[PDB]
Design a protein around this nucleic acid. Structure first.
Lengths: 48, 108, 120, 135, 176, 63
RNA sequence: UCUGUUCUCAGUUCGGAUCGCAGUCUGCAACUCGACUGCGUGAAGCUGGAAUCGCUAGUAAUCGCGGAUCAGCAUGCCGCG
RNA sequence: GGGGCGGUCGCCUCCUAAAAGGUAACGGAGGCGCCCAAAGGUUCCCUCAGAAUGGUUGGAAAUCAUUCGCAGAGUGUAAAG
RNA sequence: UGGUGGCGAUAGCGAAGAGGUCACACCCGUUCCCAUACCGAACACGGAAGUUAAGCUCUUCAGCGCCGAUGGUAGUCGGGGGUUUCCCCCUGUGAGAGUAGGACGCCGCCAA
RNA sequence: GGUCCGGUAGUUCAGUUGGUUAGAAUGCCUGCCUGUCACGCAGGAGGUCGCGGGUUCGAGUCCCGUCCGGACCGCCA
């Protein structure tokens, strides 16, 4: 199954991005690097 | 090894060489006697010249690569000559001559 | 014999592939390279009118070297074509490898053109 | 009883008929043939009956050619039902025959017997026919 | 190497005179000698290919590649994605170093030998061997061998027809 | 070649029991082939001298 | 059986079946359809389900040796230790 | 094509559809309520399915080598483009 | 003769035949740049032993493929009839599978 | 005429869902047991899945149609 997830960051709490993922294929708490708006630069986004 | 086949490396020479299809106990003992190989030695420990000069003697006797084919063409001769012996070979029943009634189970 | 395709025939497909994306317009012409076994050719081409502007080769009638096909020749011909662009100055060009791999004498030629001042 | 051994769909439009036949307008394989001069449908029962009426009479004289195949099926709703609510099941195969098409052709047989035998078979078909021969 | 020098010195002139090629370099030539491995795995024993690879590396001069099966087939229960077989290509000095071992020691060392397949050719100069034992050169650590499956061997030449390749293989040194 | 993955390959002399010498390279360094192409019966051109082969269909009762 | 040498737990030097080759004997005669022998070969079998048999000491268990049948034909039978 | 019962109710592909678009019927055929951290983005490089012939374990097909081969093969999935 | 563009293959596919001092291409060997999910054929690398065999470039051809109006017809816009699921007459309009034949290349710009 | 079920060893039922394995009693066969038979005790073979077509690396077990039977409905004037 695919489950919704919202992305989070350590550089700053305010994070907004959403995505989809498969529990079987990625049980681990996934990481992506994306442009945070309020920090005004690219940072590394975890999920919640 | 000896003639296109292996030999166990840790057995007495006289017994060990018999494994090649074509020589049994008597043939092995007489040919190793002719060679002068002491008749009892693990084949691991033997010398190169004696190995080589026991190769040629057994090559001048027929061994498996030729006896197998030769026995097969002999039974082939018996088959297509139309012999009673041949048809017994063909059908797989005993050939030497036995009462097929009771046992006959070594074949089939 | 075993059907070995011509090396130039194979190269032409790659050259067409890369040419599909770009071409050299007016005031933005295109450089080109032939990496022949024995020589290296360079050309500045304007696509739309279908005519060249200036060219250079290892077998040019001066400044020769016994290389005539190696990286040293590539550097020398590169700075030569830079001057050949300079007199009827263009100052900018779209690079276009001749369906080659940007590692060797093509890189030497590109380095020569850049240092001579043809702003890619 | 020519079944098409398979078909892409078992139901399709009845279609319409206009103009002469597209091809096979004259004899091509036999000495003589029979031609239809109006448009209509022709079904397994018709071709089978005509074929038997031909061959059983002609006996050992020769061979008979058929240029027809009922690739077209045609449907019919089950008896005693209000119309509508789905196309009916298919229960027969039919061949379109525009005018000019030559149906049957005969080979290796005398002229007069072929003439009268084709006349005999023509009554099996529902269609005005005209005798026709190779140029 | 030895053979090759001989190929330059004696073979090419001899058969060039024997066939009258106007251009000398048109003379036929061995292009590659290639090995294929196949293991009835689908997986039957996962360690089978993982053994065949590093025995075949010793047999040849360098490491092979595990062959990736093309399409799935339930006849052998061979799912698409479970590796079967291995391939190593040989050419240059290596092909002659390989043919050296083969012609000199390997074929005469077979459990039994007569003249090699009479008409194994494909039709256009290519030619294949099916040898059942791994006994190719006598210094393999042969006691290790568990499975007896030998090699599938293909010699590829620049020949355009079977007759010229047949003639060439003679003085290359293959019996028939 | 990609360094390391291939085994060490080097010059490897060949010695047969007949003394025939051959100029080979191998993963190994010295090989003792028991019988070589100069000796093996079929390989001897045509059984030149490595042979023991007679064949007859005979019928002889005269003693 | 006793003594001594080798073998070192395996389908093995156990087992010897069945096979091709070459012989011996008898008998007019050994293909159907003998026995024996030299080679080559070497099979199944690694203690046998449910069940079942003989045996009260020179017995059972083993080991051989003769003998009637008779040219040859014995793992049978009779008898002996 | 009276109700009841049966069937259907949203979305996507094609035909019906009358060479723009649109166009109904309890007309004719299928599918969707997802899946993919790569099956995305980009740079770089190629080329198919099937067939014939040789090749063992291995045949009709496993894995190889040659030749033919404008697309038959693929394109996550249902049709069309 | 090489390079590089536009044009519908009238340019293709085949069958034959010519060339190479120069140009090109095969070739020579991986020493270091780079690479072979195995490899110097391929990638690149640096030469120049010999070869026009192939590629490439030229000469020839209607076997295949391709292009192709003329008059016919079938269809059909718009009118008019008929015994009208379908036929026929008039103003046009105009199918394609068929032949008349065209073609086995035409235009450039930089280096000979 | 419609809707829904099913169809497997010689007989009766699981599996039929688990797409990637065909099973359990009875019957039958051999042997033992008994004076013989029957019980009983050892062992053993079988179907390759109603029929046809299709998806899939793979159909018994998924989707279609055909045959077979069985359950339900077939009402208002």
């Amino acid at each position: 199954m695919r489950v919704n997830i919202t992305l989070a960051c350590t550089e700053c709490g305010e994070r907004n991005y959403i995505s989809k993922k498969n529990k079987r294929n990625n049980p681990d708490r996934v990481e992506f690097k994306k442009y945070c708006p309020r920090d005004k630069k690219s940072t590394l986004h975890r999920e919640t | 090894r000896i003639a296109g086949v292996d030999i166990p490396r840790d057995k007495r020479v006289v017994i060990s060489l018999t494994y090649i299809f074509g020589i049994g106990r008597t043939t092995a003992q007489q040919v190793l006697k002719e060679a002068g190989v002491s008749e009892d030695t693990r084949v691991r420990d033997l010398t190169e010249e004696e190995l080589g000069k026991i190769r040629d003697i057994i090559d001048k006797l027929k061994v498996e690569g030729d006896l197998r084919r030769e026995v097969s063409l002999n039974i082939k001769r018996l088959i297509e000559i139309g012999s009673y012996r041949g048809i017994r070979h063909r059908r797989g029943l005993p050939v030497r001559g036995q009462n097929s009634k009771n046992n006959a189970r070594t074949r089939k | 014999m075993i059907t070995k395709t011509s090396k130039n025939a194979a190269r032409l497909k790659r050259h067409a592939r890369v040419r599909a994306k770009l071409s050299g317009t007016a005031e933005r012409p295109r450089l080109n390279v032939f990496r022949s076994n024995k020589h290296i050719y360079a050309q500045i081409i304007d696509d739309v009118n279908g005519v060249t502007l200036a060219s250079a080769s290892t077998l040019d009638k001066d400044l020769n070297v016994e290389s005539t096909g190696d990286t040293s020749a590539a550097t020398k011909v590169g700075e030569l074509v830079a001057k050949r662009a300079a007199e009827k100055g263009i100052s900018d060009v779209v690079f276009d490898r001749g369906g080659y791999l940007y590692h060797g004498r093509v890189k030497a030629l590109a380095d020569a053109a850049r240092e001579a001042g043809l702003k890619f | 009883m020519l079944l098409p051994k398979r078909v892409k769909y078992r139901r399709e439009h009845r279609g319409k008929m206009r103009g002469r036949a597209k091809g096979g307008t004259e004899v091509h394989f036999g000495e003589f043939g029979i031609q239809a001069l109006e448009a209509s449908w022709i079904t397994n029962r018709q071709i089978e009956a005509a074929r038997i009426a031909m061959t059983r009479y002609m006996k050992r004289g020769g061979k008979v050619w058929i240029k027809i195949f009922p690739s077209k099926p045609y449907t019919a709703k089950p008896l005693e039902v209000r119309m509508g609510s789905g196309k009916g099941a298919p229960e027969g195969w039919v061949a379109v025959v525009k005018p000019g098409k030559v149906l049957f052709e005969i080979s290796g047989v005398s002229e007069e017997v072929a003439r009268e035998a084709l006349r005999l078979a023509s009554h099996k078909l529902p269609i005005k026919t005209k005798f026709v021969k190779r140029e | 190497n030895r053979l090759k020098e001989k190929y330059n010195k004696e073979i090419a002139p001899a058969l060039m005179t024997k066939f009258n090629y106007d251009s000398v370099m048109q003379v036929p030539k061995i292009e590659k000698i290639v090995i294929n491995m196949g293991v009835g795995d689908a997986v039957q024993n996962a360690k089978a290919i993982d053994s065949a690879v590093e025995e075949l590396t010793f047999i040849a001069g360098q490491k092979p590649v595990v062959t990736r099966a093309k399409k799935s087939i339930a006849g052998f229960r061979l799912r698409e994605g479970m590796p079967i077989g291995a391939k190593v290509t040989l050419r240059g000095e290596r092909m002659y170093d390989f043919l050296d071992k083969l012609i000199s020691v390997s074929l005469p060392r077979v459990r039994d030998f007569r003249g090699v397949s009479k008409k194994s050719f494909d039709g256009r100069g290519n030619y294949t061997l099916g040898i059942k034992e791994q006994l190719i050169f006598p210094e393999i650590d042969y006691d290790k061998v568990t499975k007896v499956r030998g090699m599938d061997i293909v010699i590829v030449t620049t020949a355009n027809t079977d007759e010229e390749a047949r003639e060439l293989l003679t003085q290359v040194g293959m019996p028939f | 070649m990609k360094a390391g993955i291939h085994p060490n390959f080097k010059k490897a002399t060949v010695k047969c029991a007949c003394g025939n010498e051959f100029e080979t390279g191998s993963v190994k360094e010295e090989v003792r082939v028991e019988i070589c192409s100069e000796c093996h019966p079929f390989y001897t051109g045509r059984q030149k001298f490595a042979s023991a082969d007679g064949r007859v269909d005979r019928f002889n009762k005269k003693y």
